[PDB]
PDB file of C-alpha atoms (C1' of nucleotides) and ligand atoms in Angstrom:
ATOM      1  CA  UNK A   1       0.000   0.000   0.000  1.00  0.00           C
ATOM      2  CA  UNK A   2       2.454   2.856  -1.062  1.00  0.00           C
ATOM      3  CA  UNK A   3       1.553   5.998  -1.952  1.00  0.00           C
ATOM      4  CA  UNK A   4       1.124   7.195  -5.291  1.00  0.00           C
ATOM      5  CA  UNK A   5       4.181   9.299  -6.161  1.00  0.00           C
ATOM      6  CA  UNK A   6       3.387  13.218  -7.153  1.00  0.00           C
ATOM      7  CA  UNK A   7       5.696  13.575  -9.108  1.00  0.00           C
ATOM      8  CA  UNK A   8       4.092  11.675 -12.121  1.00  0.00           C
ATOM      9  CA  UNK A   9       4.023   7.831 -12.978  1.00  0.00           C
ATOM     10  CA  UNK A  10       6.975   6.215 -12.980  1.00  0.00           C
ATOM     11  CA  UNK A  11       6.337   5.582 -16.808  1.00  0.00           C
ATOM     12  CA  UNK A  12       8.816   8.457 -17.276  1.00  0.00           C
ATOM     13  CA  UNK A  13      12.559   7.314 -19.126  1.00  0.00           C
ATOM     14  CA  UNK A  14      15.179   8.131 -17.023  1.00  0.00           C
ATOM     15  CA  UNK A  15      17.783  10.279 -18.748  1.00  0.00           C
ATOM     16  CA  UNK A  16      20.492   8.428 -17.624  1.00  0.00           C
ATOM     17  CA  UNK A  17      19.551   5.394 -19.771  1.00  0.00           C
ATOM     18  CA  UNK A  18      18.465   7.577 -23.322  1.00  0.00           C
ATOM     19  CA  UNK A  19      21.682   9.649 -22.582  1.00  0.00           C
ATOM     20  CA  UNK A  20      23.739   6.433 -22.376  1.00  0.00           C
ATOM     21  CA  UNK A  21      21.915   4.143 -25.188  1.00  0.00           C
ATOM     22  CA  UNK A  22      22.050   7.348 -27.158  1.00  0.00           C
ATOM     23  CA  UNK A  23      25.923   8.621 -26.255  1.00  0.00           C
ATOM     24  CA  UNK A  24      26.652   7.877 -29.707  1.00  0.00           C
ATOM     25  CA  UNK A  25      28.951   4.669 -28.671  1.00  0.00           C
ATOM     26  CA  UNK A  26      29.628   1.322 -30.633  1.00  0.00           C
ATOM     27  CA  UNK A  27      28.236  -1.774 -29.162  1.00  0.00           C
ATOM     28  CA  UNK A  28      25.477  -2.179 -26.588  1.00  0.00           C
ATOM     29  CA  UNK A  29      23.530  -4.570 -25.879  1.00  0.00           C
ATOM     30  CA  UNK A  30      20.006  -4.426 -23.818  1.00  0.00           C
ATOM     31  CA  UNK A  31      18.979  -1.850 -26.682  1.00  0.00           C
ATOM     32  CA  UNK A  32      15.815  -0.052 -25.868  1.00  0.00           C
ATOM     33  CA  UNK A  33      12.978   0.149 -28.347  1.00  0.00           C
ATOM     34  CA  UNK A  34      10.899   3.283 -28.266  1.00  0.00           C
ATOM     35  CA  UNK A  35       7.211   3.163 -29.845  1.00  0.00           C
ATOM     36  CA  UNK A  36       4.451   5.630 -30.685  1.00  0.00           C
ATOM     37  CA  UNK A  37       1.515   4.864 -33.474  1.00  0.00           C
ATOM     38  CA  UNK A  38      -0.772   7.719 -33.987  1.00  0.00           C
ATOM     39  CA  UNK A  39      -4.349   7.958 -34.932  1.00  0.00           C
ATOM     40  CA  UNK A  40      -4.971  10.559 -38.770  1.00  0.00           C
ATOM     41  CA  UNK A  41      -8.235  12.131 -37.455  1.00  0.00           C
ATOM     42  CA  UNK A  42      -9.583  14.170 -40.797  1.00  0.00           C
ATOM     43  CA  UNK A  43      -5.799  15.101 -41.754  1.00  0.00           C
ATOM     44  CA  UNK A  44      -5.311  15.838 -38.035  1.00  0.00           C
ATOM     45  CA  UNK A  45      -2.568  13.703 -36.528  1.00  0.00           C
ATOM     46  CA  UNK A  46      -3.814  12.854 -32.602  1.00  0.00           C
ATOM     47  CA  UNK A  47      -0.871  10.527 -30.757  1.00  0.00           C
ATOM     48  CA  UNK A  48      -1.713   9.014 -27.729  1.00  0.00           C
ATOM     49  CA  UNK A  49       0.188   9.447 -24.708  1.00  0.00           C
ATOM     50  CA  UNK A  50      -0.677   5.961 -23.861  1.00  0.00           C
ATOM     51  CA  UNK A  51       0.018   4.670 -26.687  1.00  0.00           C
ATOM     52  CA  UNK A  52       3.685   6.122 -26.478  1.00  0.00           C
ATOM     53  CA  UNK A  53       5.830   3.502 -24.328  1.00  0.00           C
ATOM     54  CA  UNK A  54       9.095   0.888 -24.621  1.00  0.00           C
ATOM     55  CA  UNK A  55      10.182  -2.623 -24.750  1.00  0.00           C
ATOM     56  CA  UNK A  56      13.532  -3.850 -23.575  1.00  0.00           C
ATOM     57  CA  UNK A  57      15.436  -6.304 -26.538  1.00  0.00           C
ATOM     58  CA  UNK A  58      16.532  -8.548 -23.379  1.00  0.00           C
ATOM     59  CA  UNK A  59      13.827 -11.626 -22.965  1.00  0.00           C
ATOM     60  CA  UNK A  60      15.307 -14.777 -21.477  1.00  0.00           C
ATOM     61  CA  UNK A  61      13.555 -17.943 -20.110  1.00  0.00           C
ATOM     62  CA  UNK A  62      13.924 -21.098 -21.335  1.00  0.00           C
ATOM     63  CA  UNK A  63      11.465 -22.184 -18.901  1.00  0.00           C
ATOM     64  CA  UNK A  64       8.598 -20.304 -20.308  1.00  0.00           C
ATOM     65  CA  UNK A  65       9.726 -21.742 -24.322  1.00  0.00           C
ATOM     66  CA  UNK A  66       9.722 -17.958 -25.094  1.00  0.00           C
ATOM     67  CA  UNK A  67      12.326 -17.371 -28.008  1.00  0.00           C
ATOM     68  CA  UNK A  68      13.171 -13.989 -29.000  1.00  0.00           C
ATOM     69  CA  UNK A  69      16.078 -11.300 -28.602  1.00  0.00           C
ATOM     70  CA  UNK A  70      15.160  -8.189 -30.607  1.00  0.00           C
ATOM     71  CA  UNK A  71      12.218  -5.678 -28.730  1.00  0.00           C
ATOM     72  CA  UNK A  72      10.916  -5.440 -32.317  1.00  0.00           C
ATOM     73  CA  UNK A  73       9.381  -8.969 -31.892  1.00  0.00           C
ATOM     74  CA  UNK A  74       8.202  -8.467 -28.342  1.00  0.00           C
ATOM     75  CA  UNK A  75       6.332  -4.872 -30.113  1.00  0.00           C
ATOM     76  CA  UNK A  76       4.910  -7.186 -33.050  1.00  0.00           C
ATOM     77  CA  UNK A  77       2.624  -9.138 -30.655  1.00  0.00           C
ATOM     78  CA  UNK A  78       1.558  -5.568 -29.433  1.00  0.00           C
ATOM     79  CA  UNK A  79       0.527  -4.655 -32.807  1.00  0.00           C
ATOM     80  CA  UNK A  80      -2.184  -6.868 -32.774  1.00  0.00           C
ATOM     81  CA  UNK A  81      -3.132  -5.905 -29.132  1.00  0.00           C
ATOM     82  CA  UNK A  82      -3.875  -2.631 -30.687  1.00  0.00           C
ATOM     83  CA  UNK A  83      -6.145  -3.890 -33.244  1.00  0.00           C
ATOM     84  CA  UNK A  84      -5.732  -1.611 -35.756  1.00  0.00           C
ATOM     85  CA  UNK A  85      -8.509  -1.370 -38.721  1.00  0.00           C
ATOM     86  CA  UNK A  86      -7.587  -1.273 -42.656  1.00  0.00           C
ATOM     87  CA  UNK A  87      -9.757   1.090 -43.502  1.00  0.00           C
ATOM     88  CA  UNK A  88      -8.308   3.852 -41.401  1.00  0.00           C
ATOM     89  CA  UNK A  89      -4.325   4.887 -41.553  1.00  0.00           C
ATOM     90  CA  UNK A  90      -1.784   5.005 -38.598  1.00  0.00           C
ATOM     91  CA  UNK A  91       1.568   5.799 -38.488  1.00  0.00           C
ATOM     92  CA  UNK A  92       3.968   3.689 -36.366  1.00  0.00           C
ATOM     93  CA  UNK A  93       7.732   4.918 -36.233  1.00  0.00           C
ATOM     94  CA  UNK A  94       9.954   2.291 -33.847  1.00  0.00           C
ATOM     95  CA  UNK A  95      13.073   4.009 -32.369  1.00  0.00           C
ATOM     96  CA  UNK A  96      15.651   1.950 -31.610  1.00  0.00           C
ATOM     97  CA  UNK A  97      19.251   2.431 -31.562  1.00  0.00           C
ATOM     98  CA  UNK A  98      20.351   0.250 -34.272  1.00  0.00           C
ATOM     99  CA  UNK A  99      18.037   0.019 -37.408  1.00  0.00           C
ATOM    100  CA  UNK A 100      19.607  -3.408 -38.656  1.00  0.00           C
ATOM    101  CA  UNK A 101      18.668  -6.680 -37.663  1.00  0.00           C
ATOM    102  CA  UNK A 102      19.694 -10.312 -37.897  1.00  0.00           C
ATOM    103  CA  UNK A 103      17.494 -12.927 -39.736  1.00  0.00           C
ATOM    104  CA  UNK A 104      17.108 -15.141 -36.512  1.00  0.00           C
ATOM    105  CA  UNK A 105      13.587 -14.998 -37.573  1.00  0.00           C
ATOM    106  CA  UNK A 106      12.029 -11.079 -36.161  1.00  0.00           C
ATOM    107  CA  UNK A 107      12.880 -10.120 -39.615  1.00  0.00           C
ATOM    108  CA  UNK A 108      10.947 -12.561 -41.235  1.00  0.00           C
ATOM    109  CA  UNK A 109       7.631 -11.540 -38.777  1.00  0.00           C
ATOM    110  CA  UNK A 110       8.275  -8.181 -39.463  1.00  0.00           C
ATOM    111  CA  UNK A 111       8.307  -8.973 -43.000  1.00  0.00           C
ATOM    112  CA  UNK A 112       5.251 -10.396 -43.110  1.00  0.00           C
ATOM    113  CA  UNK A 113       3.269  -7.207 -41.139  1.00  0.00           C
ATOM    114  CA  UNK A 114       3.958  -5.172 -43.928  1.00  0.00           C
ATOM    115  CA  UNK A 115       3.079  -7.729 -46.393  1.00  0.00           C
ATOM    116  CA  UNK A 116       0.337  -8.284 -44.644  1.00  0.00           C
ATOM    117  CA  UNK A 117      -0.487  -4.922 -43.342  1.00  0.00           C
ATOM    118  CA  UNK A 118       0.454  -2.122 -46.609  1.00  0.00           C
ATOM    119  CA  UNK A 119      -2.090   0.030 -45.283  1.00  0.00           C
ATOM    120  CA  UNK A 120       0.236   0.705 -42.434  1.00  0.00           C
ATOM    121  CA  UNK A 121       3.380   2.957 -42.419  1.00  0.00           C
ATOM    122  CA  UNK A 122       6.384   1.772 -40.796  1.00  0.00           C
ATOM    123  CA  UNK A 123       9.515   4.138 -40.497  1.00  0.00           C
ATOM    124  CA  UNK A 124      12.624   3.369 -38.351  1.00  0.00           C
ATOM    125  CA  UNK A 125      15.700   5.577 -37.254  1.00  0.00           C
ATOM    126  CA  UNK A 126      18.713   4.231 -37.451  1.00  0.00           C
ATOM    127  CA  UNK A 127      20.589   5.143 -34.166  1.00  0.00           C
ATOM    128  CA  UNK A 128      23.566   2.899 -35.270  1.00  0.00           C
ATOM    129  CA  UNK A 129      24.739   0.230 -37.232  1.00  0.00           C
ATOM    130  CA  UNK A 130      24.136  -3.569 -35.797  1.00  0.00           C
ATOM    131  CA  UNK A 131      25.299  -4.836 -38.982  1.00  0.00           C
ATOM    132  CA  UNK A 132      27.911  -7.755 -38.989  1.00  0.00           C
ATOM    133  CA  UNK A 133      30.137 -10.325 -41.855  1.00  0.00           C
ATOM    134  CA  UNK A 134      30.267  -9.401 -44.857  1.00  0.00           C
ATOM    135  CA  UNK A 135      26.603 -11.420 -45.271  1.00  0.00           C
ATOM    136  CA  UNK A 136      25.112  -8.351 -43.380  1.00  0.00           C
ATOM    137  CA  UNK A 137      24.927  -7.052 -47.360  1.00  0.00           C
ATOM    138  CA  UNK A 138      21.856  -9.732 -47.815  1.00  0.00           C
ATOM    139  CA  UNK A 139      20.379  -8.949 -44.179  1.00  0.00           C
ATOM    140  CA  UNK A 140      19.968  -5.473 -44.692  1.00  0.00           C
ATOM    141  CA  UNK A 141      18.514  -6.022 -48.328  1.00  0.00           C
ATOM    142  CA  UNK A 142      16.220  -8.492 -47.122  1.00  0.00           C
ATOM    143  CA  UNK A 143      15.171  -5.766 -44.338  1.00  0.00           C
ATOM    144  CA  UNK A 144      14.853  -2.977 -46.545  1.00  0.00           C
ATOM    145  CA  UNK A 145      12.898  -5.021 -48.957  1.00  0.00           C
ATOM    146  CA  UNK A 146       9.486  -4.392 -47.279  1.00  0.00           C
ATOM    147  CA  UNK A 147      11.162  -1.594 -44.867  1.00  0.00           C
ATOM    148  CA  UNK A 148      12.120   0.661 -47.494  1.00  0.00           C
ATOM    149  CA  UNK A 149      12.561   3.608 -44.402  1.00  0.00           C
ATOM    150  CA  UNK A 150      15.737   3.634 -42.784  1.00  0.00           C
ATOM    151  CA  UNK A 151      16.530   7.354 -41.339  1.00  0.00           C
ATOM    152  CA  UNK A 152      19.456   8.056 -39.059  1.00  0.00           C
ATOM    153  CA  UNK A 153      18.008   9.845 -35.462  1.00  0.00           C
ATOM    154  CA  UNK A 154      19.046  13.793 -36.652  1.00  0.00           C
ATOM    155  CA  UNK A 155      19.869  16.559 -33.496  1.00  0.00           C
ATOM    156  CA  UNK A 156      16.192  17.610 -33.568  1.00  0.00           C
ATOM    157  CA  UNK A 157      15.051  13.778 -33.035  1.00  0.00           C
ATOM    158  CA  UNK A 158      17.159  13.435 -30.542  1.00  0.00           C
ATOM    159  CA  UNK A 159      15.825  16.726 -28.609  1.00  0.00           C
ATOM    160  CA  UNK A 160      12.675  15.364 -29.433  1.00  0.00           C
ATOM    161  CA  UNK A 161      13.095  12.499 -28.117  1.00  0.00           C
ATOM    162  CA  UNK A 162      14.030  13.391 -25.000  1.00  0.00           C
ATOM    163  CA  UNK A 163      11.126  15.654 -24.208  1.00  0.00           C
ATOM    164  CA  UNK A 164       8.607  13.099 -25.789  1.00  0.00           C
ATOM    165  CA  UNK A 165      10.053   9.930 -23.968  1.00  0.00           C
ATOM    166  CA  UNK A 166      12.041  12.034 -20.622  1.00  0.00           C
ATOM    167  CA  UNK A 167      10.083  14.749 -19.342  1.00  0.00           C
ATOM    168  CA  UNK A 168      11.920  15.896 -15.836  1.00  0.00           C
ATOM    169  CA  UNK A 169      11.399  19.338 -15.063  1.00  0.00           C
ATOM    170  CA  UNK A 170      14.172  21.221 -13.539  1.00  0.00           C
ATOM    171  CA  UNK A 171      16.805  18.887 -16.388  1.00  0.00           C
ATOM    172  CA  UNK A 172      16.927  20.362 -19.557  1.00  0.00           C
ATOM    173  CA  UNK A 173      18.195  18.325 -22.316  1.00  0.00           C
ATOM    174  CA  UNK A 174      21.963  18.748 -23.343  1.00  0.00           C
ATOM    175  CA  UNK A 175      22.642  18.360 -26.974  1.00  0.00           C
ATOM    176  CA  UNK A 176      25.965  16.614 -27.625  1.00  0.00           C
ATOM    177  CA  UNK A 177      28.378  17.750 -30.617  1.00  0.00           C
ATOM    178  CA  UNK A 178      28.322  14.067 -32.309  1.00  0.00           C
ATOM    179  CA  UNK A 179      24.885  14.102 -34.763  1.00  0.00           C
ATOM    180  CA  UNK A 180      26.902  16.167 -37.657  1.00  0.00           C
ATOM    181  CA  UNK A 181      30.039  13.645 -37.686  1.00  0.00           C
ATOM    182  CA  UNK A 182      27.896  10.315 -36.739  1.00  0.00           C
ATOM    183  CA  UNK A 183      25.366  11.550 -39.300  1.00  0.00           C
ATOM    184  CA  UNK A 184      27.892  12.245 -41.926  1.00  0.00           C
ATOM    185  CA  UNK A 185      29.526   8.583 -41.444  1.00  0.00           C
ATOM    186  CA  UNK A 186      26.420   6.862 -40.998  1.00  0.00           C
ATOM    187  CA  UNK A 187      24.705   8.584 -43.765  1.00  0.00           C
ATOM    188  CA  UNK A 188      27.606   7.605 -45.829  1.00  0.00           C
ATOM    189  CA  UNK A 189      27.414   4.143 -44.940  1.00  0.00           C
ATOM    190  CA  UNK A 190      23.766   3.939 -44.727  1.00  0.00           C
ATOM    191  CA  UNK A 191      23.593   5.159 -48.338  1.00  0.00           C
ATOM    192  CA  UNK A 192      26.432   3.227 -49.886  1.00  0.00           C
ATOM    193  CA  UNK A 193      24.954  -0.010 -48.505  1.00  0.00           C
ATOM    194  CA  UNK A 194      21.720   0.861 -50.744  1.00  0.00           C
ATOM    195  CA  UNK A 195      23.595   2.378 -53.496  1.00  0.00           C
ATOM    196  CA  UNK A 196      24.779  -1.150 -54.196  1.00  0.00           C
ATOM    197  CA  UNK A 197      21.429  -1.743 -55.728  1.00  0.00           C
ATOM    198  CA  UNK A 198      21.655   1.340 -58.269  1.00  0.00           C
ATOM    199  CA  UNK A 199      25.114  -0.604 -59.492  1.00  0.00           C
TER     200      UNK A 199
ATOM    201  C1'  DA B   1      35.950  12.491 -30.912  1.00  0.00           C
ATOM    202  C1'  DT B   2      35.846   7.745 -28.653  1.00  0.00           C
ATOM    203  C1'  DT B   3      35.684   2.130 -35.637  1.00  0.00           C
ATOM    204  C1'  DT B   4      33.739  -4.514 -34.477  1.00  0.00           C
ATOM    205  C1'  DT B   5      28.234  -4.029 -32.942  1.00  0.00           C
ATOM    206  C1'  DC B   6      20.344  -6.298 -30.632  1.00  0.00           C
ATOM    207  C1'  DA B   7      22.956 -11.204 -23.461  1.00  0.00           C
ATOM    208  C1'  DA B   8      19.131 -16.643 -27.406  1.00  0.00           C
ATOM    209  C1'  DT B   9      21.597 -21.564 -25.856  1.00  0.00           C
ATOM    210  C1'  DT B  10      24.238 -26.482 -26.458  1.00  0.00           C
TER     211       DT B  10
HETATM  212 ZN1   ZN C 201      15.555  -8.568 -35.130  1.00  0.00          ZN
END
DNA sequence: ATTTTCAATT
């Protein structure tokens, strides 16, 4: 019987965590995936704060027979939770720090959403490269074969980010100096992986 | 500024 905290829920992101997933570093594991699907309401966009939340990409337990690694998978048994109908259009944009993904077998189930669901607009950001071999050509082909939107997370992204999943007040966010270099590199790479299919 | 990367098992 504890007493609800005034502050707010504690459904808030601490900054520590977005500031660390997000300091721009090279390997992490535990990822966080970030959600939010919004509603068109006669050409009027309404999000739902509830709808807005996160899934962690770390799901052990043999015990249960559970199999899965990536959030993404854990978010596509949401999807259906949610119900959406055909004949209206939602936009769901996953943030996640690396855009990439293995074909353990999320890719394939993501696949098939978008097969299955083209009335439904999926857009990722690309927060950094989980790539891997040389075969990580194919994987990201067979990825970008149904998701055709790959984006790197730009400075404004990332400041929006903050105040739409960390809203403390009293801690403004601090912008680092790493989105114009990490952009530039990853936008280079990000592009020459597709460019491969204009040769 | 940080250049080898999605903590599932046999
Ligand atoms: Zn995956």
């Amino acid at each position: 019987m504890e007493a609800s905290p005034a502050s707010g829920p504690r459904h808030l992101m601490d900054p520590h965590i977005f500031t660390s997933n997000f300091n721009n570093g090279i390997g992490r594991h535990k990822t966080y995936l970030c959600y939010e699907v919004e509603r068109l309401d006669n050409g009027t966009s309404v999000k739902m704060d509830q709808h807005r939340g996160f899934l962690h990409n770390q799901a052990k337990n043999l015990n249960s027979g559970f199999y899965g690694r990536h959030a993404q998978l854990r978010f596509l048994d949401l999807v259906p939770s949610l119900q959406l109908d055909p004949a209206q259009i939602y936009r769901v944009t996953w943030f996640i720090s690396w855009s990439p993904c293995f074909s353990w077998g999320c890719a394939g189930e993501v696949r098939a959403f978008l097969q299955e669901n083209t009335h439904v607009r999926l857009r990722i950001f690309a927060a950094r490269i989980y790539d891997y071999d040389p075969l990580y050509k194919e994987a990201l082909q067979m990825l970008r074969d149904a998701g055709a939107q790959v984006s790197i997370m730009t400075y404004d992204e990332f400041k929006h980010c903050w105040d739409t999943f960390v809203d403390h007040q009293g801690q403004p966010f601090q912008p680092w100096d790493g989105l114009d270099e990490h952009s530039q590199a990853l936008s280079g790479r990000l592009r020459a992986i597709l460019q491969n299919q204009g040769n």
